[PDB]
Amino acid sequence: IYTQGKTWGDTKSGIWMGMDNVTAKPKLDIGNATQYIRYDGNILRISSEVVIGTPN
Amino acid sequence: IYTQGKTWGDTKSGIWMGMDNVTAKPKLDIGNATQYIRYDGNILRISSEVVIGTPNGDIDIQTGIQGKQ
Amino acid sequence: IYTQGKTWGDTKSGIWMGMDNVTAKPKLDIGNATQYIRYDGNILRISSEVVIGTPNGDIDIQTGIQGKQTVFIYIIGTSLPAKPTSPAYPPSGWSKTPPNRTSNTQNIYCSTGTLDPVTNQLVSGTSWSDVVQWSGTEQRGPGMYSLAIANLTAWNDSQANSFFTSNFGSGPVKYDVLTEYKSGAPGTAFTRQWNGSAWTSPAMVLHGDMIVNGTVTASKIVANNAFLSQIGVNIIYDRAAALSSNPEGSYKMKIDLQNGYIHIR
Amino acid sequence: AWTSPAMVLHGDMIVNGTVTASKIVANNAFLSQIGVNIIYDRAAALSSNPEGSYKMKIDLQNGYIHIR
Amino acid sequence: AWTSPAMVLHGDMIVNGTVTASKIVANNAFLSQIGVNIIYDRAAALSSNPEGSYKMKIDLQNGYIHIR
Amino acid sequence: MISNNAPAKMVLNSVLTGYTLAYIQHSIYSDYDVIGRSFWLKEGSNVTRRDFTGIDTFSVTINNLKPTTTYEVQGAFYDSIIDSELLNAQIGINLSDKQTFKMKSAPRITGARCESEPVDVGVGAPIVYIDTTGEADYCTIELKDNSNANNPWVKYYVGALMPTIMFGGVPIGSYKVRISGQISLPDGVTIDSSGYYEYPNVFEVRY
Amino acid sequence: MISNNAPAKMVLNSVLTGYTLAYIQHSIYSDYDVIGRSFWLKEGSNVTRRDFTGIDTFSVTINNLKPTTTYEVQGAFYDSIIDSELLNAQIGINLSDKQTFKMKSAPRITGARCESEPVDVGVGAPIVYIDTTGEADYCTIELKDNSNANNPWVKYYVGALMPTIMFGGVPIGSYKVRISGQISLPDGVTIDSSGYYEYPNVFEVRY
């Protein structure tokens, strides 16, 4: 499932999420070419800074 | 939304995303049995190794860095 | 793509993922109002505490792992000896049990560091303690721990309390942390640190190792060991005095700030 | 100037292994064994020239205590 | 052996609460209060059997300091 | 009249048994001069006295044992007035009651095959079927590509051990399946890991 | 030379509390003439004596205790010399020093409710929001359709007790709700449950 004209390694900002019969590992990519959450089947990569929890 | 024949918290290698009416919480799972990103409304679990940011993410563009002794 | 009614960052429980045409940035929102994983085009927010890695993920499958502690009384000695240098549970020609002595001689022990049963010798580092003459008979440092539960669905304070009062027979100390996982499924696990009374689950848990190319800032840091090239501090108490006694009456302390001196007490 | 960090935790953190970082800043450190070469005052360490520090338990080479 | 960690970061870390770990490694440290059982020299601490070879040791629990 | 009473008889709880390892939770001593603990393993007609001089903890673990062998454990706290020779002679101490336990058996695999996932439409993804026999919990299972002899071993399942184990995410090809179950003990850090029992027969998975 | 010895006063190592069952770890007897161990609870107004035959194990399980009632524990071993009348008098027993512990409280439901989101197309999924006030480590919640005269109680939620509990996937009929808490004794097998508390109100699931 993806926005039109988007690929897991494209420089276009978009969403791409689906299987890969080459490795049978799910792949997820969401964000632009410099701020993204690239989840390879084996390693999860985040570019933009992340906030965990809420203050109080 | 999921790949055919896939269920949350299962050994299959699919993706699952939707509302679990049984517990009335959203659910998520991306990955195989071992390496996965599983999220339940109460708690999130990420089995696979995680990397945040990129090397030289906040490097000065005008000037580089270096070290000497 | 989204559950009906849900919108990005809306109170009602649901999910949302789609484009922001004006900003041309992908957006994602999953979870309730209080707990959620929301990712705009510039920031990723996770309200609910996240656990990364799994217990016993990076263990050797060829050989397990275990820890043990030994304390042996090992001299019929006229004078105080020099502490052993060989890291072997029976040290260099050194007895393992209190032997018999003549009236002139005395007995000296050493609080041997942690022993490794697999190697049957002192683990790397942690040399032998100072030798002290054995007269009559001879709090514990907080540490990390894990436990297995046959069928785990949520954190069990009762199980953890039973664990500590069974193994150590004294209950947990401050800053202790125990992780409980379901037997047959290490993926599902719960971790909590005991401070003051009862257990408080942390906002985040890591099971392997953490590597940071930059700096780290925290209110306080506790670790069983550290190796720092340069350290700058104003005051430094003793661990027992620092954590056990809030008033810091008893101590053996250094004071870099203000007047600098050494106090033995 | 001001800067944005890699990621921020608004609660405590637990790491079952070892944590490595270029440099550490904290208020209270409750450890059990530390290996350090040279130690200065907090302000002196933060200074451009630590030579003006109040105390130094230099250990890598000198191995002597000198109080200024 | 080369070992892949659980977390990798490249910016900076912020923790409002507290961070706990089995052990720590860092080039620099700027602290305010420290409570430690024993203090060693980095060369001795990294080396096996530190108390066999240590430039200066202080045992806060036993109120002892030694310089060779 | 002055005396030094012997430590009370040691009481052992149920023996948690893992292959090549053991866990015994005993009682709390009360005498004022208890300085060590010991246990007399009895395998067949062979007796091994395992002694632990650490009194700090109240749980113990024998590092080395013989796989799949019934044992006998008798434990006892001893005072300072007991010497190595006296302890060896079991003189002047109160020994625990007899207890019988048996060791565990490492997991072993019977078969491996490729099956297509039953689906209502389309090409169902392959799912690997392996039948497992043994004694462990959350046994790990791996695979190795057979194209080359240097291919890495890749973990694919750590779930609970079952008579039949299934999992997905296996690329099409030929693999040699490897299993080595794990079993923990109450102790904080003691984890038991068996050797690798790989399947002699290579199997191939295809759509 | 001949003499008699009273059993050494034991030390209660620890006590784990259940809102109906009490677990105590105590030292081991050291005298041959010991025949049994006894305990003397204190409700704060009436003193209750409890004893358990056999001294095989280091632990005990006191039953039939009033929930939400702090108690004081003191007991020791009594040998064959001690008589029932003398034991009641507690003259020569040389019991252990008292120790005070707080007995936990059974779970209760503060309120019962159910709400669901209106939907443009389709049907809003029923959900149940129920707020508790207990302190059990983990609690199970049952349900029963009250419209029929007699229906079997059915479990629908199993998990940790929380200020607010959310669950769904339940049929449409009006229901009665009972809540029970279960706390695990130090022994893995034994689990202490609670008397089922039932909300007096009866409500239809929000459809």
Numbering used by the authors:
A (entry chain g): 414 to 469
B (entry chain f): 414 to 482
C (entry chain e): 414 to 551, 562 to 688
D (entry chain g), E (entry chain f): 621 to 688
F (entry chain f), G (entry chain e): 1 to 207
The article reads:
In siphophage T5, the unique RBP is located at the extremity of a central fiber. FhuA, an outer membrane E. coli iron-ferrichrome transporter, is the bacterial receptor recognized by T5 (25). We present the structures of T5 tail tip, determined by cryo–electron microscopy before and after interaction with its E. coli receptor, FhuA, reconstituted into nanodisc. These structures bring out the important conformational changes undergone by T5 tail tip upon infection, which include bending of T5 central fiber on the side of the tail tip, tail anchoring to the membrane, tail tube opening, and formation of a transmembrane channel.
Upon RBPpb5 binding to FhuA, the central fiber reorganizes: The three FNIIIs strings dissociate, two strings relocate on one side of BHPpb3, and the third one on the other side. The central fiber bends by ~160° at the level of the hinge between the third pb4 FNIII and pb4 spike: The latter is now surrounded and stabilized by pb4 FNIIIs, which interact with and stabilize pb4 spike small decoration domains. pb4 spike also undergoes structural rearrangement, with a different twist of the spike. This bending and stabilization of the central fiber bring the tail tube closer to the membrane, orient it correctly, and anchor the tail to the membrane. To accommodate for the drastic conformational changes of the FNIII strings induced by the bending of the central fiber, BHPpb3 hdIV-FNIII linker is pulled and, like a zip, disrupts the interaction network between neighboring BHPpb3 monomers and with BHPpb3 plug. This then allows the rotation of BHPpb3 hdII-III, plug unfolding/refolding, opening of the tube, and anchoring of BHPpb3 to the membrane via the β-hairpin legs. The three β-hairpin legs connect BHPpb3 to the nanodisc: Their tip is composed of 233-Leu-Phe-Gly-Leu-236, which would insert into the outer leaflet of the lipid bilayer hydrophobic core. In the crevice opened at the interface between two BHPpb3 subunits, extra densities were identified, in which the 43 C-terminal residues of TMPpb2* could be modeled. At low contour level, aligned with the tail tube lumen, a hole in the nanodisc is observed, strongly suggesting the presence of a channel at this position.
